[PDB]
């Protein structure tokens, strides 16, 4: 940690308390688990499982989910202790600002500004696949159905439309309902269980026999791909102002949501590859494709509808997590403060959701899903590594702190989170480093020409 102006935890309580003073707190460990599951299950399991099975691991994609799941478990425990120690309405940016400080907080924040954005484009691309697949059986123009390659398509229009629709939704700001959230999440969980219950009757173990055709090398490169599917448990700390006793219900919501998805993910990979041979799984809607391939067409409509109504929740959470990140970074002074009128004569701090949304809408319509997922994955992995180290830093500096939940084993588990994650980063392409490093160099320039012009310069 270089050039550290740590934010005092007392100051984070005052901001999370002033913003959440009018809000009614009544959420529990179940509502927070719905907030986690509703932000995890999406394009990663519904779409990326097909490409990862076909071209990375094969039937051994279950080991890819176990290795990738193990990395997220160790990292989720670190996020949990931060949510238990710093129970503020903030994520890895607010945690790094209190443990490392300014420079590390800005790099991670600048890293997350992109990670939430590229993931928003990635979630919408997979959403466009299931929406188009559900329509056929109809089809739009052939030139407006995917990214721009050498033969076929120009722009992904459905992915563009759903982004501008969620941008229109977040602009209105309909008061989110805790009961409405549990319904949409249960739709997602039931159709995943519906696939597993129906699909188990059609599993031929012959489709498992070439278990590791690409070897463990392909198991590892697939683990970095479906690592995308586990992201979302960090969104539990969003409603930190609306929880009675956040010190213990937020760690519960984080871990319980992740472990539930891990079991469902391990189950889907085994059934999906057991039904369809892995070579035929490279398709935009593998779960709906698996039900069609095996003559269960009527159920493939249910799963396609639950995916349409379920993936659209991950997109709402992702773009909000990016919008709220602009609100917090500019509040800390590291970005220019924008303002707009909320009443005819009362102006408030403003973040242009139509510009951040239009930027997401562009990339969702021209970039293929495998690239957006990989670029999202390098951003999430570095943010995961920083938090896993920050726990050990917060253990050494400020040890006598209130920790309702604390990581099981003091050094071993956070170190394992770092090694597991850092091993996954090595299995990503080198071109993913191009857009990621050059993005950090742009932010590193911003910090040394404007970052030291903030609410903590003095």
């Amino acid at each position: 940690m270089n050039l550290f102006r740590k934010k005092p935890i007392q100051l984070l309580m005052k901001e999370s308390g002033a913003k959440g003073a009018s809000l009614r707190k009544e959420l529990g460990a179940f509502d927070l688990t719905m907030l986690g599951i509703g932000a995890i299950i999406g394009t990663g399991i519904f779409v990326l499982t097909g490409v990862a099975a076909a071209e990375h691991a094969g039937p051994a994609l279950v080991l890819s989910f176990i290795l990738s799941g193990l990395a997220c478990v160790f990292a989720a425990l670190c996020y949990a202790e931060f949510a238990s120690t710093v129970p503020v309405s903030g994520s890895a940016y607010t945690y790094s600002y209190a443990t490392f400080g300014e420079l590390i907080a800005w790099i991670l924040g600048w890293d997350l500004i992109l990670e939430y954005g590229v993931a928003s484009s990635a979630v919408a691309v997979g959403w466009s696949g299931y929406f188009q697949g559900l329509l056929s059986g109809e089809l739009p123009k052939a030139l407006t159905s995917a990214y721009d390659p050498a033969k076929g398509t120009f722009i992904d229009l459905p992915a563009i439309i759903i982004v501008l629709f969620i941008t229109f939704l977040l602009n209105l700001g309909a008061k989110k309902s805790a009961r409405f959230n549990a319904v949409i999440v249960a739709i997602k969980v039931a159709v995943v269980l519906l696939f597993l219950a129906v699909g188990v009757w059609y599993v031929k173990p012959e489709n498992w026999t070439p278990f590791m055709p690409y070897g463990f090398s392909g198991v590892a490169t697939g683990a970095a791909t479906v690592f995308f599917a586990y992201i979302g448990f960090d969104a539990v700390s969003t409603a930190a102002e609306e929880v009675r006793n956040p010190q213990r219900d937020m760690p519960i919501g984080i871990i319980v949501s992740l472990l539930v998805c891990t079991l469902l993910y391990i189950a889907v990979s085994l059934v999906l590859t057991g039904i369809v041979p892995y070579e035929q799984l490279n398709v935009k809607n593998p779960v709906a494709f698996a039900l069609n391939y095996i003559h269960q067409d009527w159920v493939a409509g249910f799963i396609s509808l639950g995916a349409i109504a379920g993936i659209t929740t991950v997109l709402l959470v992702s773009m909000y997590g990016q919008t709220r990140l602009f609100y917090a970074i500019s509040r800390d002074g590291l970005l220019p403060k924008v303002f707009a009128r909320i009443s005819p004569t009362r102006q408030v701090p403003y973040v242009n959701t139509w510009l951040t949304g239009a930027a997401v809408a562009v990339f969702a319509g021209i970039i293929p899903l495998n690239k957006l997922a990989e670029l999202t994955n390098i951003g999430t992995l570095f943010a995961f590594i920083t938090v896993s180290i920050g726990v050990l830093v917060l253990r050494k500096t400020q040890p006598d702190l209130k920790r309702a939940f604390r990581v099981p084993f003091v050094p071993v588990v956070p170190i394992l989170a770092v090694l597991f994650c850092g091993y996954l980063v090595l299995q990503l392409p080198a071109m993913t480093w191009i857009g990621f490093v050059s993005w950090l160099l742009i932010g590193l320039v911003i910090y040394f020409i404007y970052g030291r012009k903030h609410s903590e310069l003095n």
Binding site: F30, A182, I187, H295, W298, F302
Partner: peptide, 27 residues
């Protein structure tokens, strides 16, 4: 958290009931 646990289990069973129903009338 109280009543929301029921609305979760309800529509979960409603979807699985209709899903189990459609899967029986196929192939």
């Amino acid at each position: 958290m109280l009543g929301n646990m029921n609305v979760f289990m309800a529509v979960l069973g409603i979807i699985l009931f209709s899903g189990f129903l459609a899967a029986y009338f196929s192939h």
